[PDB]
Amino acid sequence: GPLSLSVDAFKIPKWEFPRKNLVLGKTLGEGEFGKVVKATAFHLKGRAGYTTVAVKMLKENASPSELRDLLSEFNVLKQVNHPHVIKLYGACSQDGPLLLIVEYAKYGSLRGFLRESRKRALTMGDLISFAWQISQGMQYLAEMKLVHRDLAARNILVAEGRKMKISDFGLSRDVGRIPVKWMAIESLFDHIYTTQSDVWSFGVLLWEIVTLGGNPYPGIPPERLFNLLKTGHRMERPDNCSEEMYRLMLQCWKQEPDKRPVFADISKDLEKMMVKR
Amino acid sequence: EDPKWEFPRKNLVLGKTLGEGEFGKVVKATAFHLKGRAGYTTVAVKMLKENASPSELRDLLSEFNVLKQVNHPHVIKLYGACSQDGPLLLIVEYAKYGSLRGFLRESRKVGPGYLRALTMGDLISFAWQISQGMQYLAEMKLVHRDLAARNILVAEGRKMKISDFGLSRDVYEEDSYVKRSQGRIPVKWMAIESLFDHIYTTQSDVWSFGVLLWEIVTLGGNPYPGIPPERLFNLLKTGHRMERPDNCSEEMYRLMLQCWKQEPDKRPVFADISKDLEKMMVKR
Numbered sequence A: 001g002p003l004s005l006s007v008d009a010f011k012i013p014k015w016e017f018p019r020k021n022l023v024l025g026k027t028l029g030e031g032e033f034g035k036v037v038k039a040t041a042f043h044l045k046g047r048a049g050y051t052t053v054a055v056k057m058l059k060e061n062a063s064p065s066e067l068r069d070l071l072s073e074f075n076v077l078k079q080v081n082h083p084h085v086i087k088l089y090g091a092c093s094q095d096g097p098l099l100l101i102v103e104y105a106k107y108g109s110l111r112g113f114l115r116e117s118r119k120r121a122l123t124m125g126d127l128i129s130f131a132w133q134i135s136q137g138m139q140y141l142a143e144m145k146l147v148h149r150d151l152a153a154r155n156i157l158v159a160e161g162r163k164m165k166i167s168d169f170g171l172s173r174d175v176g177r178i179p180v181k182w183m184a185i186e187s188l189f190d191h192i193y194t195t196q197s198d199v200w201s202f203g204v205l206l207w208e209i210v211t212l213g214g215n216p217y218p219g220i221p222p223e224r225l226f227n228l229l230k231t232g233h234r235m236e237r238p239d240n241c242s243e244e245m246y247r248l249m250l251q252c253w254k255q256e257p258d259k260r261p262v263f264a265d266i267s268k269d270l271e272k273m274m275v276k277r
Numbered sequence B: 001e002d003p004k005w006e007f008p009r010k011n012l013v014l015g016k017t018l019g020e021g022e023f024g025k026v027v028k029a030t031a032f033h034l035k036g037r038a039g040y041t042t043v044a045v046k047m048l049k050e051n052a053s054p055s056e057l058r059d060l061l062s063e064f065n066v067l068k069q070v071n072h073p074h075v076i077k078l079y080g081a082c083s084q085d086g087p088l089l090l091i092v093e094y095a096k097y098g099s100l101r102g103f104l105r106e107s108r109k110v111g112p113g114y115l116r117a118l119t120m121g122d123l124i125s126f127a128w129q130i131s132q133g134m135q136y137l138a139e140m141k142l143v144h145r146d147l148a149a150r151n152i153l154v155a156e157g158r159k160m161k162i163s164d165f166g167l168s169r170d171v172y173e174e175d176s177y178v179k180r181s182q183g184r185i186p187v188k189w190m191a192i193e194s195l196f197d198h199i200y201t202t203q204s205d206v207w208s209f210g211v212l213l214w215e216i217v218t219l220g221g222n223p224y225p226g227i228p229p230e231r232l233f234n235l236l237k238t239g240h241r242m243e244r245p246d247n248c249s250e251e252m253y254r255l256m257l258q259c260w261k262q263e264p265d266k267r268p269v270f271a272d273i274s275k276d277l278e279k280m281m282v283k284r
C-alpha cells in the first residue's frame, strides 16, 4: 500500500547521513508522531566538528499513521528553506531505526518558553516580534502551497537568539488528528484544510502568545466547541491584550475563510504595530 | 444521549487517573444508583483530554456504539454515559487488576510469580476466555482491530475482559473493514494484509490474537524484540515470524504460527482456537 511503497523508497545522497557520525543524547520529549532526542552530528552538511542537532524517531509501538507522518515530515522539509522554518539536515535510513536529523532549537517549544516567562522577562514588543517571525514563515509556506494544519504554540520552537522556528510537519499537506481547539470551523464541519484554516490556527496561536502560554477555551470541553463556534462565539479579549491585537485575532476566526486575513496582511499588521510602538 | 444509557452526571464522582488509552484518559470513579443497584458502585470512566482531536472523539463514540450492542462475560461492560452539561463520559465496568500486560509483567516481580500465582494452565485459561469473547464479537460482525495484552483487562476473580473498542469497526455489510488512510493500530500487532493492503477482517483479529498469545506466554514480553517497527514490512513479506518463546509448548507455538499464516483463510477461526485451547487445558 502507500506506506509500504514510501518505506521501501526511503530505505533504498544529499540527505543520507552516516549513522556512525551521529551520537544520540538527552531525550527532549515526544511529539505528534514519535520521540525527540538531542544529538551531536560529526561533519553534518560539510560543517567542521560536531553540530548539535535534534533527532526524530519512532516509538516501538508506532502505528502506520505515525510512520507515515515521520516520512511525510521528511518529504515536506526537503522542499523548504526559510529562517523561521526548522531546517532538515538529513536522515539515517540504512542502520537500524529510521532517524530524521533536524535543526536543534535550544529553548524548546514556544509554549514552554512563554510559560516560563513573565511579562526571563518579555515585553509586548518581543511577543509581536515572535508573532511576526511565525507569520513570515507561514507566508513562505503558503507561497509554496503547503498547508501546515497543526499550527500551535507547542509546534513552534525557540532557537538561539529567540528565533521562531515553525516545526512538527507530520500533519502538513502539499496543497483528523489536529486538536479540536486549534481547528477552523470549516475543518471541523467540512474536513477542509487550506491556508485560510492555517490562518484560523494562527489566531489561536496569537492568543497563546499574548496570554504567555494560556490554554485556549479554558473550561470548555472540545466536544462542545463545534456548537459554540457555529453560533458565533469566540474567545474574549485576554487580560494584557490591546484592541488592535485582539482585532487581529478575531479576524483570523471569521466564519467565512475569505474574510480572514492572509499571512501577508498578518505580517503587515505586526510590522505596523512594531514601528508605531 | 440515549435514555437506555444516559446517567445523571450528579450521581457520578471521578477519582484518580488510571492512565491514557487509545483515545483519551481513563479515571477511577464511583456511581450512585447505577442501573438500579443501591448505593455506590466503583466504575471506570473514559473521557477526552483537553487537546482532543476529532479522531479521538470519534474513537470514544465508536467504543460507546460497540459496547451498547454487546454483552459477554469476557467483554468489558458498558454501564452508561454522561453526554449533557459537560464533557462526554463513558461509564464502564471496573477491572481491579488493570491490563493483562501489566498483571503479567507484575507476575515477574510479585510472588508467588510464574510457577498472584500463575501456571501454564492459568495462561491457557486466560487465552481461552479471550478467544471466547472474540468468537462472540466475530459472530456480532465486529472486528476489534487492536487486540493486544494492553487492551485486555483482568477483573475480580482474574477474569479476562476484552477492552478498548475505540478502533473497533462494523463489518456487518461486507465481512471486511477497509480504510484508504493509514491505520492507528501499532504495526507489531497488525496482520500482514492489514499492513500492506489496509484490509481488516476477523482473520486479521486472529493474527493479532496470535501476537497476544505470544505476549501471554512470555508474561508480557515485547513483540519482535529489538526490531524497529518499519522493518516488519520486509520481515513479514519474506516469511519471518517470532520464534518460539522459552515458556511455550510445541502445540502452543504451532497455534501461534497458524494465527500468522500469510493466507488469512489458512488461519484458524476463533471457534477452532477455543477448541485448541480446551484440548491443551484438559491434557494438562
Ligand SMILES: Nc1ncnc2c1ncn2[C@@H]1O[C@H](CO)[C@H]2OP(=O)(O)O[C@H]21
Pocket (backbone or CB within 6 Å): A028, A029, A030, A031, A032, A036, A054, A086, A102, A103, A104, A105, A106, A107, A108, A109, A112, A157, A167
Ligand atoms: N528541533 C528541535 N529542537 C529542540 N527541541 C525539539 C525539536 N523538535 C522537538 N523538540 C522538543 O520535543 C518535544 C516534543 O515535540 C517538545 O518539548 P520541548 O523540549 O518543549 O521542545 C519540543
Ligand SMILES: Nc1ncnc2c1ncn2[C@@H]1O[C@H](CO)[C@H]2OP(=O)(O)O[C@H]21
Pocket (backbone or CB within 6 Å): B018, B019, B020, B021, B022, B026, B044, B076, B092, B093, B094, B095, B096, B097, B098, B099, B100, B102, B153, B163
Ligand atoms: N475498565 C477499566 N478498569 C480498570 N482499569 C482500566 C479500565 N479501562 C482501562 N483501564 C486502564 O487504563 C489505563 C490506560 O488504558 C491502563 O492501565 P492499567 O491499570 O494497566 O489498565 C488500563
